Amino acid sequence: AFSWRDAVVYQVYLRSFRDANGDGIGDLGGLSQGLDAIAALGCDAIWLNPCYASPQRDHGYDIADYLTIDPAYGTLEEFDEVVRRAHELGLRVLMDMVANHCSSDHAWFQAALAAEPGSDERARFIFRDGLGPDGELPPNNWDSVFGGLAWTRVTERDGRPGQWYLHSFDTSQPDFDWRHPAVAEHFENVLRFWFERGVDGFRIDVAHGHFKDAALPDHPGGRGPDAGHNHGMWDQPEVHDLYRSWRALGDAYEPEKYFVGEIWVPSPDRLADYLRPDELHNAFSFDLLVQPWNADRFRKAIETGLAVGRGWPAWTLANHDVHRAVTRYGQEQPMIAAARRRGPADLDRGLRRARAAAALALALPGSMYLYQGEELGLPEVLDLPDAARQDPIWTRSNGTELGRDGCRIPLPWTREGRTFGFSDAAAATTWLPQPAWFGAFARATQAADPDSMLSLHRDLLATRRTHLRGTEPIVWLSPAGAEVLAFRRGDVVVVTNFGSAPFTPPSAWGALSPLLASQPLGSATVPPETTVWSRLH
Ligand SMILES: CO[C@H]1O[C@H](C)[C@@H](N[C@H]2C=C(CO)[C@@H](O)[C@H](O)[C@H]2O)[C@H](O)[C@H]1O
């Protein structure tokens, strides 16, 4: 039967999955068409990046209406059909909860801008007087995650500059005041609304956000690279009461709803508090995602994930915010900055390592989140033309930080077609341009090739379901620091040879016959940069 503990979740970046309407934008009609492909791959659930009404200044994470689907993606009726079709295929459905902030076009925030200092409208956000004799300094020294100030100054109704409002992310994403009672009430209503439509749970955006220190103190570390975690801006005690309330709400349903947090905090003990039994079910294990190709760093990150997750963490190797794994591992090897390195990526090296890494991560106890396109071995499109970039990171850095658009390129479905089957002929230009070579990675081509990245993922998910029991914990076979990672789970032994020479496992690891491998191999040595799953006799 289905279990969240062992779920393999396909992350659907809807804008770039499949364009059924022919407007150049991935949409719900396209997702409906592609659900058969997700289930055939072997996945257990889908998580949709936010598809609510949004001006797309942060591509869905700036929400203007939490109770409606963006008209570019479809109607609520089409959404209901997607949910029922997914369910009919056995796929559970996670939506994306974005409650730290809303779009500046949300009706509440437009009302706040039009209201006076001290109004209730502004009290639902974080508006403060500026510092300096004319208020020209921001109220404190906080940085936007996307670069620049975390505050924007507004014009008051006398036409002169006045108060500033806080935005942890883009200027167009004002942060709520989570101490204002209307905010919590609104988000309980949002949860209930979507749960009523059969949504099975939420991925929680900025789960370390929502509450800040009520005094909004300056970060003593400053703005610089090694300023450190801004303790006043994130990860406050009140956020745990919030998740207790959401968990209690979700636990009233049968089956109970599911919550996975997107949490970025440095301390594993701080992270673990989000996963206490009355709070969130899980959180992405980002330590592994940011590691370079290195056996020792992988092992340490896996150890951290297993402790924080109490034995069944939520693993992921890529998402819509970081460089694709084929690029990360194909580059020369040296928090989130580690997953956004620039420089030449060797495609064959990156594909080899990405295959081995997928095979390793899918053997770990717990759940696994596959970002769309990773099952095709897509590289990051680093050479996107300047003019095509849309990520606020690009604009706010004046072009000195590339941003995330290179992992959001519309997927290739067929070798043929001007958009590689992402849309039909008659369709508008795609919202981000696909490179001329994307057709080489087409899903249909890979499905027909037993050696493809897609076929490897299909084999892994099939073998994971038949041979890997969720109740069997890791028994480490290799020692700390080894260049070859090896463990046993029940009667399956997993070996990842991170190095460039073949490796012969010591006979004490058992009498092994191979189940699958991320490369060819009929010997008992593990080829370079290869993962092998074997049955233990
Ligand atoms: C290092 O992580 C930081 O930067 C990341 C980009 C953020 N990720 C989420 C936060 C926002 C803001 O809604 C969207 O722009 C991202 O796509 C979403 O996945 C993290 O919450 C934030 O802590």
Tell me the domains of the chain and their CATH numbers: 4-101+194-213+255-447 (3.20.20.80), 107-166 (3.90.400.10), 470-536 (2.60.40.1180)
Residue pair 377/351 in contact (Cβ under 8 Å)? The answer is yes
Run of H or E residues at 515: strand 512-517
3-state secondary structure of 229: coil
Run of H or E residues at 456: helix 453-467
The tokens of 367 are what? 């759940």
Residue pair 245/188 in contact (Cβ under 8 Å)? The answer is yes
Residue 152 CA, ligand 1 centroid: distance in Å: 19
Residue 262 beta carbon below 6 angstroms from any ligand 1 atom:
yes
Catalytic residue positions?
Answer: 205, 262
The tokens of 118 are what? 């001290």
Atom of ligand 1 nearest to the CA of 100: 13
Residue 340 CA, ligand 1 centroid: distance in Å: 14
- How far is it, in rounded angstroms, from Cα 474 to Cα 167? 42
Q: Vertex 120, ends 50 and 182: CA angle to 5°?
A: 45
Residue 207 CA, ligand 1 centroid: distance in Å: 10
Quote the longest CA-to-CA distance of the chain. 81
Residue 99 beta carbon below 6 angstroms from any ligand 1 atom:
no
* Cβ partners under 8 Å of residue 475, min gap 6: 487, 488, 489
The tokens of 328 are what? 């990360």
Does 255 sit behind a cis peptide bond, omega within 30 degrees of 0 on the bond before it?
A: yes
Using the structure block, give the residue that is written with the tokens 């290799």. 478
Residue 219, by phi and psi: left (phi above 0), alpha (psi -120 to 50) or beta? Answer: beta
H and E: helices and strands count for the chain:
14, 18
Residue 205 beta carbon below 6 angstroms from any ligand 1 atom:
yes
Residue pair 460/362 in contact (Cβ under 8 Å)? The answer is yes
3-state secondary structure of 316: strand
Q: Which amino acid is at 393?
A: I
Residue 59 CA, ligand 1 centroid: distance in Å: 12
Residue 337 beta carbon below 6 angstroms from any ligand 1 atom:
no
The tokens of 217 are what? 């103190």
CA distances 514 to 88, 286, 458, 511, 537, Å, are 34, 30, 17, 10, 11
Experimental determination approach used: X-ray
492-497/530-536 β-pairing: antiparallel
45-48/92-97 β-pairing: parallel
- By CB neighbour count within 10 A (0-12 exposed, 13-18 middle, 19+ buried), where does 217 fall? middle
